[PDB]
Amino acid sequence: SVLVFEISSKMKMIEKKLEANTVHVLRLELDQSFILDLTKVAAEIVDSSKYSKEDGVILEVTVSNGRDSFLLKLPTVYPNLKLYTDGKLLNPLVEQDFHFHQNLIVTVQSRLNADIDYRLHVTHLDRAQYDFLKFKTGQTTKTLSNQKLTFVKPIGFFLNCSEQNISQFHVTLYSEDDICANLITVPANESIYDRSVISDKTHNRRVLSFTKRADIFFTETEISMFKSFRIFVFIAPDDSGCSTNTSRKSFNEKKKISFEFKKLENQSYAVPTALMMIFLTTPCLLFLPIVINIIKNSRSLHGQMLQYPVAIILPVLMHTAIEFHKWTTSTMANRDEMCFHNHACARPLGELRAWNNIITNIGYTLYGAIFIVLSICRRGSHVFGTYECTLLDVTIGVFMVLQSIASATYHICPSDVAFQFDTPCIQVICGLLMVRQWFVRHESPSPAYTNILLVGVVSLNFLISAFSKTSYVRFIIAVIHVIVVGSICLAKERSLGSEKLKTRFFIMAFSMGNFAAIVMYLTLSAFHLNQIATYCFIINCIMYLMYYGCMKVLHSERITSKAKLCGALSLLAWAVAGFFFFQDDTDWTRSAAASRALNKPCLLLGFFGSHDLWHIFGALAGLFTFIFVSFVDDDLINTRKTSINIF
Amino acid sequence: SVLVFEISSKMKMIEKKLEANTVHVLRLELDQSFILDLTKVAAEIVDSSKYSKEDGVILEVTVSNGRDSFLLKLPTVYPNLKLYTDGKLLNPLVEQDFHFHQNLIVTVQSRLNADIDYRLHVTHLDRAQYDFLKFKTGQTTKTLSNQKLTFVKPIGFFLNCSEQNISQFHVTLYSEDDICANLITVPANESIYDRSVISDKTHNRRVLSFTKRADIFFTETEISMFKSFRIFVFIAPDDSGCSTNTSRKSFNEKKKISFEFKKLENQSYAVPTALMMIFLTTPCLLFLPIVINIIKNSRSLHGQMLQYPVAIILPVLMHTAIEFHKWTTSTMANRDEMCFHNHACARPLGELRAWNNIITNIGYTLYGAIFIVLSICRRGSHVFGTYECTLLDVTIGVFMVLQSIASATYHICPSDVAFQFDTPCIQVICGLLMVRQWFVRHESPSPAYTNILLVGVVSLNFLISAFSKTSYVRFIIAVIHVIVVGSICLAKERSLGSEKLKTRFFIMAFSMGNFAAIVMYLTLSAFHLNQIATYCFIINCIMYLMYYGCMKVLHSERITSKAKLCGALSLLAWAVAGFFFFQDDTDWTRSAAASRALNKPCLLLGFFGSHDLWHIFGALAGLFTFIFVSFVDDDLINTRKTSINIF
Numbered sequence A, B: 001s002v003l004v005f006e007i008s009s010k011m012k013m014i015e016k017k018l019e020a021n022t023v024h025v026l027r028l029e030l031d032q033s034f035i036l037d038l039t040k041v042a043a044e045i046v047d048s049s050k051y052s053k054e055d056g057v058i059l060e061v062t063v064s065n066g067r068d069s070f071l072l073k074l075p076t077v078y079p080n081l082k083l084y085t086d087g088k089l090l091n092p093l094v095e096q097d098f099h100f101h102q103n104l105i106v107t108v109q110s111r112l113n114a115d116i117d118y119r120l121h122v123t124h125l126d127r128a129q130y131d132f133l134k135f136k137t138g139q140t141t142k143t144l145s146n147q148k149l150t151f152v153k154p155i156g157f158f159l160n161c162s163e164q165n166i167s168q169f170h171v172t173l174y175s176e177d178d179i180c181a182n183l184i185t186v187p188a189n190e191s192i193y194d195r196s197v198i199s200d201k202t203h204n205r206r207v208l209s210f211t212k213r214a215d216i217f218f219t220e221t222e223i224s225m226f227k228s229f230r231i232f233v234f235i236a237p238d239d240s241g242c243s244t245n246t247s248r249k250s251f252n253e254k255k256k257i258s259f260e261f262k263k264l265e266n267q268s269y270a271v272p273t274a275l276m277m278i279f280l281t282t283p284c285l286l287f288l289p290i291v292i293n294i295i296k297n298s299r300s301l302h303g304q305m306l307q308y309p310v311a312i313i314l315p316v317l318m319h320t321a322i323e324f325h326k327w328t329t330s331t332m333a334n335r336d337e338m339c340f341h342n343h344a345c346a347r348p349l350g351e352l353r354a355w356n357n358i359i360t361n362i363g364y365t366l367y368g369a370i371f372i373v374l375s376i377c378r379r380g381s382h383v384f385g386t387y388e389c390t391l392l393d394v395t396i397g398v399f400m401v402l403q404s405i406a407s408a409t410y411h412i413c414p415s416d417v418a419f420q421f422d423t424p425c426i427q428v429i430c431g432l433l434m435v436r437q438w439f440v441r442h443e444s445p446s447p448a449y450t451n452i453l454l455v456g457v458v459s460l461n462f463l464i465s466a467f468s469k470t471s472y473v474r475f476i477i478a479v480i481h482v483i484v485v486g487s488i489c490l491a492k493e494r495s496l497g498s499e500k501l502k503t504r505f506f507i508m509a510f511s512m513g514n515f516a517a518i519v520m521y522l523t524l525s526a527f528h529l530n531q532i533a534t535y536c537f538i539i540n541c542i543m544y545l546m547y548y549g550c551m552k553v554l555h556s557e558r559i560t561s562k563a564k565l566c567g568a569l570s571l572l573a574w575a576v577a578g579f580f581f582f583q584d585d586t587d588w589t590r591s592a593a594a595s596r597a598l599n600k601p602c603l604l605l606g607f608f609g610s611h612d613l614w615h616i617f618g619a620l621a622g623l624f625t626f627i628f629v630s631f632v633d634d635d636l637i638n639t640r641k642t643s644i645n646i647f
């Protein structure tokens, strides 16, 4: 039998008993006072312990106001807990709906043949913080501070971009509590709870789980698709999307959140970009006096061009093609749940959420293209000087350009992919500079050593991503670090005859230098896994170029004044770049909400942060290091290859 | 005001008028006759034309039986059409629910202030075809033939694997009509229409859109996760997921479907696998008399091993690492919507849906490992014979092994990825055999030519996938085909001096041979895009090895009887392999339902189809072709390199 109850507007908690096989229909008449009133109706099952063995849905509640509707099926079962009380939000009535009256209908049923007591909570949350995103003339930023969020009273906004003349929009949520919450956004026509065919395929709803920070970027193309959005903030009752351990799953914890809503206008960062190019083009004047003037004073390739390793480009270009496919097929809402930027220092350009991280890689392209051009132009000598490193200096400029393609692609969506490919091209540039100085006095160094160098770099960075969740990953690196460095110490003595002068102290310097690094990242959690292999290559590259320079003065060979300047600029730029690299703090083993909570502001001009200066000083470091090795043996330009000392 | 109506069980169509701001509550009392009765309640808006300008949801209908519930929000808007009549299925009551009576409650509302006429259709579809998947003792396959499917009466099954002792399960749907339909499957506890947090991330519902065939594989690990499933078949009212063109979006078309339910037991295919290994190990006896006996009769590497191109392995191993990540992160339900197998010839092993397509690539691994071992073992001569191709014959065996890794990885999930990587390693094996015969009389062929060969293969197959949707993609291939072949014809005359004897007819044979192929795939839609570049490499490889053999008799050099046998086995095996390759019929430009409709049965032993014999005869073809080039110049073993003719 069906029982109809008339419920007043004053009644906020409704306690009734659902007799066996009885249906309760509760009605609340709605008038103009309910326009833009976001209402939450929740149901409680009194004496939840009585229904422990009863499986399935014990109580069914359906709430409707004629415009929106939802279903409350209790218990609502989560992976960790079962809740015998839950509610949902009813999209408010609008002035179009309103003499004539709307009405709020709640229907309660149960398949159980026993009597069931329940409680209905009708919560209102409106009149502010809903209808807040209305921007007055000449205003671009609005702020809500310390808005309280409970499991009973969620937060919810409505954004009409057609009404507010909004082209791009940014939402930021600040919280100091580490309490799990959810940021749900959908188009106004869509429903949070209503599933659509091909859910994962066609999905316009974004659910960002956060603790201390969360960011929403409504791109200009997304605003035009829907023209209006609904933003909701809920407390996650299960902390799985934000924490790995199960801790006090059942709780009643309030959460204070601060909001910032930006009305973004498309802009060109002409001042930070021009000042970045002036800073990057200034050190290229070192090429002018020594390298370029020789090209002025002077005025089979197909055998070298078809045997040159061009499959070293494929690891980077096949990653770029896959990351662009994964980016253009993703929906506008999926790009916010998937890509993890540092939104305190993320400046957008179109759909790109961090343009500063993409354009700051232009020093690698600029310098890499100069390394290729100058090496090709300055190869015009067979009896005097050291052997010309023309094709290895072109390979260093290729990986300098590839590092700009690999990093600009990582910064489009920084998600936890199998092959990271932000740093790895730096590790090849550093190993190629050691291969150059290894053979420069023996022979003309071959770019064929890039294959074993790149395969070892690509295989090692995939081996760290695969075992990153494990506890012994830093030991897997250390045993490879010893095997790789113990092989180089054995390759040196076999080549140089194990002389006590040069070979005996090369081994101790590299054994103590690399063991001091292993003790730092193995016995101490000094660096992150993404930074461990990159710091080890830079230190070994610097240690070898310092050994090569220390051996040069020990053999009574003078280092030119220019090579000492470029050598000190190489040490200085690698230390400044390594200081900004040390501040990345990106671990893909932690939860998505902990990866979102990390926010470090911009250091310079509102555009450059610690990461963008690592891109800028990593290319300066690669520039000055390339200019040092190219100038260090200029005093030997008139010495016969037979007289030249070999180390 | 709320109006309560009592509706009898005889009333199948309910026509009422929803007055302005009135709520109708309709009740149907349910008794034991409704156990396992899957019911569909649909609502119609009479005079749909009256509500054309009214936006949003005009009518709201909520149906519940105490155990299940749903919401009908009319009009249900699809991308192409708006439907003013739709319904959903109510999960049936069970004997646990049943003196005591259940009841079916329908609630009707409208936000409109005008009167609205509606019709309620209560359709029953049960007592057979629901509770049909009960398997009697000793029965493993059940079949339903020509089950009629309409938009008003959908199909729906219930599978209890705990009750039926089912470990693995396969569902197949056969239809001869090209009418769009949907195959929806979910766990019994889950709901088709109830959305879950992180929908795309945590999704156990599979929606397969099909026209003529659809397949479901319940793996052993999925059966254990849920233990019971609900299978539904609906007619897609919008044909977007199955057709590209909008055609008669509104229709009332019946569809006849045939079902086949298999109770699969885990099995080892010992007979097809052993007979495949006997067939693959038999032709290895050609290595025994000539190659191996020399190794018996006879009884700097680090310079070649560190300069050997090992970055040619990275394109294939970095694709395998990405396809395994995309496979282990996918849910059990997503692997059926994403991977497109030929399920008429797909034999499963564990989670792998096509084990026959993975294990038939073992001839590439077997032969590739023999190519590596024999080449390394038979390099022990500098004045007699042709130049030893030791490191290029190892590179051919590396890409022979890589083709087994690249194809076994493609067959785990054949989805439309950016880089296909099923054939491309064959194109390098065919180009490496031309590089071998190009230089074998000039010098020792270098594996360094693999870089430009692999980069061109990888770049070309990505260029076809990128432009596959376009209409001019076969012209993009043809201009690259002419540029590549016109470069080889120019490289031949520059090397051989443009002699009328050998160079003048090499150009005409390769210009007419490659233009005859272009006319076939450009002016005719002969091959698929996946097969175009692979057929062009095989024909040029065969044309060159035939030119090399025709030049050999023109220079009065005898071809040994064994090399003529292996040469005829190379032509025969490339024609048999090319006959099974021609039958792939995989186009990623067509709809997913058209990619699912393709089903070609197994040819041999219930295990081998056209594709699996392409894997088997593609390795025989690569075996016999490798044995031909290794034996063709054995008559020159006692001829000085100065006397040896060069062509």
Ligand SMILES: *[C@@H]1O[C@H](CO)[C@@H](O[C@@H]2O[C@H](CO)[C@@H](O)[C@H](O)[C@H]2NC(C)=O)[C@H](O)[C@H]1NC(C)=O
Pocket (backbone or CB within 6 Å): A160, A161, A162, A163, A188, A228
């Ligand atoms: C968001 O705001 C816009 C603009 O204020 C709304 O657009 C108007 O919609 C009414 C119907 O309700 C039309 O009669 C007007 O022509 C529209 N005005 C303009 C300037 O286009 C839009 O409907 C609103 N959408 C939501 C979800 O509230």
Ligand SMILES: [Zn+2]
Pocket (backbone or CB within 6 Å): A407, A410, A411, A422, A611, A615
């Ligand atoms: Zn970076």
Ligand SMILES: [Zn+2]
Pocket (backbone or CB within 6 Å): B407, B410, B411, B422, B611, B615
């Ligand atoms: Zn294949």
